[PDB]
């Protein structure tokens, strides 16, 4: 626990403008797992692993 | 003298009308990529600038 406290007290809190929030807020949002604040924005992931790689420029045509 | 073609063989009267036109160098060599569409930077991306020999051909 102090091993994660030492990576949070010395966190480089120079925030990115609007896309990334903070290196400490991104740590807190990963550490807060069961804190279901709301279902407003949920993001998924769709990996493009299929038979498109056999053709020429298959990933750019599949995406 | 040359091997005749089927496109010429049916028009046996207009044999003096067919003509082969080659486009070569002044030294009778192959036309390179330096005389036609010389590269020149204009803005962000480059584009080939056409010369007068291209508009002549």
């Amino acid at each position: 626990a102090c091993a994660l406290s030492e990576a949070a007290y010395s966190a480089l809190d120079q925030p990115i403008s609007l896309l990334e929030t903070s290196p400490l807020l991104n740590l807190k949002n990963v550490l807060e797992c069961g804190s279901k604040k709301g279902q407003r924005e949920q993001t998924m992931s769709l990996y493009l692993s299929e038979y498109l790689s056999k053709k020429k420029h298959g990933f750019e045509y599949g995406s | 003298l040359e091997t005749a073609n089927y496109v010429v063989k049916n028009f046996a009267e207009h044999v003096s009308d067919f003509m082969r036109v080659t486009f070569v160098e002044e030294d009778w060599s192959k036309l390179p990529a330096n005389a036609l569409s010389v590269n020149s930077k204009e803005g962000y991306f480059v584009k080939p600038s056409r010369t007068n020999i291209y508009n002549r051909v």
Partner: protein, 113 residues
Amino acid sequence: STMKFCRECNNILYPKEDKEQKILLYACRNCDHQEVADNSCVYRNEVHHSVSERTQILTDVASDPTLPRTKAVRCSKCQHREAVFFQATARGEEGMTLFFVCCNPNCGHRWRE
């Protein structure tokens, strides 16, 4: 989305429709005079999305998104990865073809397909 003013009455007329004689007759509220319609068009609007009102740099929404990147191709003169790709038309073609633009600095290359 239209409005007219009454002659010698000065009120906002109402776009009602007559039942028997099919003609758009405009009537005001107080004088109850009648007048024919010279345009026959009671609505006109250059409708847009308008879902973000003064919320451009204060919200993480995006009207025009960015173009994606891929690092699986190599440019000709630059010999580098990380080029963008999209789909557009060029001088008239049935369908859209793939394009590429070299996103490397001081390169300036773009090749079709």
